[PDB]
From a paper:
Nucleocytoplasmic transport proceeds through NE-embedded nuclear pore complexes. With a molecular mass of around 120 MDa and an outer diameter of ~120 nm in higher eukaryotes, NPCs are among the cells’ largest protein complexes. Nanobodies (Nbs) are the isolated variable domains of heavy chain-only IgGs. Using a selection strategy against conserved epitopes, we obtained anti-Nup93, Nup98, and Nup155 nanobodies that block Nup–Nup interfaces and arrest NPC assembly.
We have now characterized three nanobodies against the Nup98-APD. To understand this difference, we solved their crystal structures in complex with the Nup98-APD.Figure 11 xhNup98-Nb2i and Nb3i recognize a conserved APD region and block the Nup98–Nup96 and Nup98–Nup88 interactions. Surprisingly, however, the same scaffold phenotype was caused by anti-Nup98 nanobodies targeting its autoproteolytic domain and blocking interactions with Nup96 and the Nup88 β-propeller.
Author numbering:
A (entry chain A): 715 to 866
B (entry chain D): 1 to 124
Write the structure that this text describes.
């Protein structure tokens, strides 16, 4: 969506509303403001920002990085906007295929029985807490971990 | 990310003796998660000796329970095995396994790392 100044070109990334729809969502003032915004990366995860978000000129290629088992938003604090501005605001993260690695074989552990024996869910609850996130859910059969943050 | 392990404390003791194994992790990681000591003798599979998960659960192999004591220091990122009442079957190379949290943003990226090990010989 060139017209809104939004920069998102990486393969596998998408927005909700779609980049094509955001292209048709520029108001009389040159601005693209949506109510509820998701940026996702298929196979990896998504980040949902509730409420009114001004997307104008957002350089999502530089700002948002959804990787295996982690998200990075604003990689440089010198370029991070104040609390409540841009994407530095409350968000709900969904990460896909969040599974432990076998200590000797380095293989992914997906069996729900082994996951429950390690209490992997409790590992994710503790990891959410130690990072200041609010644990929401873990689905073992898909490895989907959901948690919420106040900002980035 | 990078992790380097330095294992030490292995040497020779006779039956009934004592040693202290140590492993120190450095590198770029956020924290140590599950940590454990293992051992491999010739002709055998590598076996778990003792472990402390990131949640605090402790586990000993039946053959060393009450003789070996694992502990961890999460300020210094080090893992120790106090081996007392050593028996000749304890002879093996000992390996510390350290799970490193390598997350860069928010998440739970964890990979396990092995060292080159430290040799224990319990001789007659
Ligand atoms: Na973490």
């Amino acid at each position: 969506s060139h017209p809104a100044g939004i920069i998102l070109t990486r393969d596998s990334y998408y927005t909700i509303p779609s980049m094509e729809e955001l292209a048709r969502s520029v108001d009389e003032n040159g601005e693209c403001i949506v109510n509820g915004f998701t940026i996702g990366r298929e196979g990896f995860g998504s980040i949902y920002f509730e409420g009114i978000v001004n997307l104008t000129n957002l350089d999502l290629d530089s700002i948002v990085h959804i990787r295996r088992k982690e998200v990075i938003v604003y990689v440089d604090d010198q370029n991070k906007p104040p609390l409540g501005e841009g994407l530095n605001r409350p968000a709900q993260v969904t990460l896909d295929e969040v599974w432990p690695i076998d200590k000797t074989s380095r293989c992914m552990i997906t069996s729900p029985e082994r996951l429950s024996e390690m209490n992997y869910k409790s590992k994710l609850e503790n990891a959410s807490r130690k990072q200041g996130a609010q644990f929401v859910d873990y689905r073992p059969e898909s490895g989907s971990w959901v948690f919420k943050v106040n900002h980035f | 990310g990078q992790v380097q392990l330095v294992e030490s404390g292995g040497g020779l003791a006779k039956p009934g003796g004592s040693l202290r194994l140590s492993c120190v992790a450095t590198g770029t990681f956020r924290s140590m998660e599950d940590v454990g000591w293992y051992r491999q003798a010739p002709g055998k599979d590598r076996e778990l000796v003792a472990e402390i998960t990131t949640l605090g659960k402790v586990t000993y192999a039946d053959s060393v329970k009450g003789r070996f004591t694992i502990s961890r220091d999460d300020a210094k990122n080090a893992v120790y095995l106090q081996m007392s009442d050593l028996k000749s079957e304890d002879t093996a190379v000992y390996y510390c396994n350290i799970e490193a949290d390598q997350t860069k943003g928010i998440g739970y990226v964890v990979y396990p790392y092995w060292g080159q090990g430290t040799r224990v010989t319990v001789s007659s």
